[PDB]
C-alpha cells in the first residue's frame, strides 16, 4: 500500500543522485526496519513518502493514490514522523501529549503514557501530566523528552509512522516496552523504522538494507544472517563482539 516503482531522486539539480532506481512495496500493517551505513538514504526514502519531495523518475504511491496528484493536506494526515531528537513545547506534558488530539481525557494519555514506557516517571512528578516541560520548565532526561514524544505519536494514530533513530538513545529495555506495543501498535498500520542499532529492527516482518541510494538486500533477520557475505551479516558481525 506503500509503492515506489523506478524512483530516482537528487535534492537538487547539482546535486548527486541519492535514490537511484528504488522499487518496493510495503503492504498495510507491515514492520519494516531499514538499516544501513550512514549517508545510505535511509531517511530521504521516508522523507519521499512525506512529498516533501518531487522524484526525477518513478512516483511514489499509497494504496494507488499518486503522491503527485494527491492532496497536499490529506497527505499530511497520513504520515506520522519521530525523529531522533524532538521538540516539546513549554508547556504542560498533558498538553504537549494531546496535540495529537485535541479534546483528549487524562485516561486516553494515560493510555498512550503507558504504552511509550513514560507513564511510570511521569506519576512519579510532582505535578504528573499538569509537570511542564520545555526550556523554562523543569528539564528532562533525553530519554524521558523522547518517550513523551513516542506518546505523542501514538496518539495521533497515522495510517504510516516512521521511526527515525527514535529510541537508538534509549535503553534496551526502555526501546524493548515500546516495540512490544508496536505488534499492536501497527494494528492495520505501517510501521517503518530507520535504525542504526540492528536489534532495534530484530523482530521486523522485513529489513531493507540501504548502500549508496539502492536497496541490496532484504528478508528477516535470519534469511539476511544466513548469506555470509551480506552486508547485513557485516554489521551484525560488528559489535556484536
Ligand atoms: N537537504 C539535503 N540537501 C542535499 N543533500 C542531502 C540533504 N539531506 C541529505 N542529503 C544527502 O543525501 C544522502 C543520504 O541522506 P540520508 O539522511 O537519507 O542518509 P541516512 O542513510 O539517513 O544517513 P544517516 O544514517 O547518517 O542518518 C547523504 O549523502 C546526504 O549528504
Known amino acids: 500500500d506503500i509503492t515506489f516503482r523506478n524512483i530516482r531522486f537528487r535534492y537538487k539539480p547539482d546535486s548527486p543522485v541519492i535514490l537511484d532506481n528504488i522499487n518496493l512495496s510495503i503492504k ?32 511514489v504511491l499509497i494504496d494507488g493514490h499518486d503522491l503527485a496528484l494527491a492532496d497536499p493536506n490529506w497527505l499530511r494526515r497520513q504520515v506520522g514522523v519521530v ?14 501529549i494531546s496535540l495529537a488530539n485535541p479534546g483528549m481525557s487524562v485516561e486516553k494519555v494515560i493510555y498512550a503514557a503507558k504504552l511509550a514506557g513514560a507513564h ?7 505535578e504528573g501530566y499538569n509537570t511542564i516541560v520545555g526550556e523554562q520548565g ?5 530519554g524521558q523528552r523522547q518517550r513523551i514524544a513516542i506518546a ?6 497515522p495510517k504510516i509512522l516512521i521511526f527515525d533513530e527514535a529510541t537508538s538513545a534509549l535503553d534496551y529495555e526502555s526501546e524493548h516496552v515500546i516495540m512490544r506495543n508496536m505488534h499492536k501498535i501497527c494494528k492495520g498500520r505501517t510501521v517503518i523504522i530507520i535504525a542504526a542499532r540492528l536489534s532495534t529492527v530484530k523482530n521486523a516482518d522485513r529489513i531493507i538494507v540501504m ?30 563482539d
Open 28 to 59: 498495510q500493517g507491515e514492520v519494516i526496519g531499514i538499516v544501513g551505513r550512514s549517508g545510505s538514504g535511509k531517511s530521504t526514502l521516508t522523507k519521499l513518502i512525506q512529498r516533501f519531495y518531487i522524484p526525477e523518475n518513478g512516483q
Open 152 to 157: 505523542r505519536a501514538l496518539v495521533n494514530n
Open 120 to 126: 511510570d516517571f511521569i506519576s512519579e512528578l510532582r
Open 83 to 96: 525523529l531522533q531528537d524532538n521538540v516539546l513545547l513549554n508547556r504542560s506534558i498533558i498538553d504537549n
Open 211 to 240: 548502500e549508496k541510494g539502492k536497496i541490496v538486500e532484504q528478508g528477516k533477520h535470519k534469511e539476511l544472517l544466513s548469506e555470509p557475505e551480506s552486508l547485513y551479516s557485516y554489521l551484525y558481525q560488528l559489535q556484536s
Open 138 to 142: 523543569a528539564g528532562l532526561s533525553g
